[PDB]
Design a protein around this ligand. Structure first.
Ligand SMILES: C#CCOP(=O)(O)OP(=O)(O)O
Ligand SMILES: C#CCOP(=O)(O)OP(=O)(O)O
Ligand code: SF4
Ligand code: SF4
Lengths: 401, 401
């Protein structure tokens, strides 16, 4: 099902159809602030960001990049850095060759290159520097910054059609075209297929799916997939997952970024957690053990159910660093915590290990299943710690090296 | 794109391919507790649950149902009630005809009917009561409660194949078959196509998509779609959205339920909010104004951006009850709050109304766009309240009756 693509190395991280779909993120600290940006790169990376982008917006930012990279490497943190360029990227890359070298990838936006005939020169200059340095590039179109000359061209094409499309549909055409024309232009200049990643982001889910199906058909490059400007909170989380899932299940997308707006005080790592959850929900990567639990209903006996499920989740999160080191494959662990006999045994038998609490009408005992069969039956006080000990025992056996 | 289906009325709410996809939920209070369950029905309904299910697990539950329904109707709350039956549904429906009458729909699980030859009688009895009362039925299979006799049948079919499928794939076959055989059996007994809804739930997203594509192909009924036992927190929210989106975008699904495990103390309404967000993210329903906002990055100037976006979201939520009454169509409002010039103007021009804060390097002014064109430019203190006044003015004009 996965769309085949050439491999693009972003630092040490391969992306493309032969490789795991890579999680990425972007900092929100001022790049010029070396200490804050280094810290946040590390934080994002420790949370699971395999690649981290940072804006390189002006000269002070550019001058900070080599120091941020040096500091990362001093602690053995080989997380690749993507520089995000707009308006003056050709100038910054030209003037600050240590920044150009320090980055692991450049992002170009075909809509923020400049005006008129200057755009083609600026593009060429950035591509030249990438070629000279052996750096990969993302050609990243975004409908917030659509090339207006291209939009007019396409508006006029549309108006000649027997049945013109809507204005909105022509915007989506123009976004794809922007990415595809720039891709083809880079290839024609000699940038390798092993050095080009494409994106074409919109902020509405159904539109993203259309756009990426077109990109996937019209190009051979690995694709960086994300719902741009997804918003805050639950809205942003849902929209992101809803937009990505149809494409990922169809085999489209080689790296993802979740564009959440943090609430004030909310950590920048939340977008990384969401990204990881999307991929794991779809069975495309495994990052950590997961808990399957029912919603609970009027059959569930007390608030013990919600508390047990939460406690199991909390313990798995606590054990994971240790586990990941000792027990190869433990990220695939599936644990169930269920509220009653209706679906409790069955669901538990689908998990690696699961517990079925007794609900209404039932004897006060809680069967535990592992590998699809009854393991034991728990009762009394301390069901939670007995269950967690059984989960521990299970992990040691099943995921033993 | 929407799959055509006959219309099934669940109380006053039509479901099927000619109708909006209906949001539903389920209570978690003991049904016998009339006061707690009435209260929670009302809470769920006020949050957007168009249909509400409650477990009817024993005699005391059954005896409460008519009183819960009476109380709802006394306040004009015409939210339909779905009774969830397992093991003894035929007995409860037979013994408590006022409960049978009070419900607006019955849920049957083909896997919780009983043993052997008793299953067919129990099924028939429930279908008979529904026919006699004019009630619709959901035939709701769940892989936590798969009919074992059917699984063995299908296991044996599989073992005769030149290339047998995995055990997991045969479970999914058996789940579909359970729903389809029961559907066909109900139809053959005379229950109308206007009285039958189907579900066949699993707890893994990719499996759900396969299952529902099969149900959709093999049956004509409206489909109740949900990812069962989706779990807690972000995991549960993401998995639910990821599982539903591919199907909903393909036109499959007539009503949805989000099966979140609440954290201790978390409201039961959270699943309703998630359901609504899935549908709105995909452009299938509109419930409330939405805010598109960028993630922010190193180009964003201060924590003002995150604070403004949050404040705009909070104000829209506060205004909505009033708005919904005065301004037909306001649920479709799209507002943008953006961090800098890179995508800020562009994205704002895609919204009904949007503001682009100044980021790094920019003059300290904030253009506001409406209907795709510059409306005004804001500066100084009080940008947030000026913007919200402009949003108010916009709404009055655009969504005037
Ligand atoms: C900076 C920024 C916005 O980031 P995203 O929403 O990831 O969009 P792109 O910058 O187009 O990749
Ligand atoms: C009670 C219960 C579980 O509810 P869901 O996860 O909605 O699954 P079904 O009861 O199969 O519809
Ligand atoms: S397993 Fe039992 S307690 Fe949990 S939601 Fe299902 S029927 Fe209710
Ligand atoms: S609009 Fe500007 S501040 Fe917001 S994420 Fe995009 S580049 Fe950064």
């Amino acid at each position: 099902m996965r769309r085949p693509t050439p491999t693009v190395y972003v630092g040490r991280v391969p992306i493309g159809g032969a490789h795991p779909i890579a999680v990425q993120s972007m900092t929100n600290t001022p790049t010029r602030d070396v200490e804050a940006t280094t810290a946040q790169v590390l934080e994002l990376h420790r949370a699971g960001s395999e690649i981290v982008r940072l804006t390189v917006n002006d000269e002070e930012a550019a001058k900070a990049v080599p120091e941020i990279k040096r500091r990362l490497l001093a602690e053995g943190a080989e997380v690749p850095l993507v520089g995000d360029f707009h308006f003056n990227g050709h100038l910054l890359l030209r003037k600050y060759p240590k920044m150009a070298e320090a980055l692991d990838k450049f992002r170009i936006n075909p809509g923020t290159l400049g005006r008129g005939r200057h755009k083609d020169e600026h593009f060429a200059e950035m591509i030249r520097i990438a070629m000279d340095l052996g750096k990969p590039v993302r050609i990243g179109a975004n409908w917030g910054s659509l090339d207006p000359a291209l939009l007019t061209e396409l508006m006029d094409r549309n108006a000649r059609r027997p049945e013109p499309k809507s204005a909105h549909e022509v915007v989506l055409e123009a976004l794809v075209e922007s990415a595809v024309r720039a891709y083809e232009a880079a290839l024609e200049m000699g940038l390798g297929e092993d050095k080009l990643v494409l994106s074409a982001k919109v902020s509405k889910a159904r539109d993203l799916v259309w756009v990426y199906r077109e990109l996937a058909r019209r190009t051979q490059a690995p694709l960086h997939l994300g719902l741009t400007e997804a918003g805050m909170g639950v809205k942003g989380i849902v929209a992101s997952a809803a937009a990505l899932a149809p494409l990922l299940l169809e085999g489209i997308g080689d790296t993802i970024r979740v564009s959440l707006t943090p609430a004030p005080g909310e950590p920048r790592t939340k977008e990384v957690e969401v990204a990881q959850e999307i991929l794991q929900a779809l069975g495309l990567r495994a990052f950590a053990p997961e808990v399957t639990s029912c919603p609970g209903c009027g059959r569930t006996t007390s608030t013990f159910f919600q508390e047990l499920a939460e406690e199991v989740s909390r313990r798995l999160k606590e054990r994971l660093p240790e586990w990941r080191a000792r027990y190869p494959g433990v990220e695939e662990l599936k644990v169930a915590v269920m509220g009653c006999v209706v679906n409790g045994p069955g669901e538990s038998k689908h998990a690696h290990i699961g517990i079925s609490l007794p609900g209404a009408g039932e004897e006060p005992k809680a069967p535990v299943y592992a590998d699809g069969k009854l393991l034991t039956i728990l009762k009394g006080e301390g069901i939670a710690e007995e269950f967690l000990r059984l989960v521990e025992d299970y992990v040691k056996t099943r995921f033993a090296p």
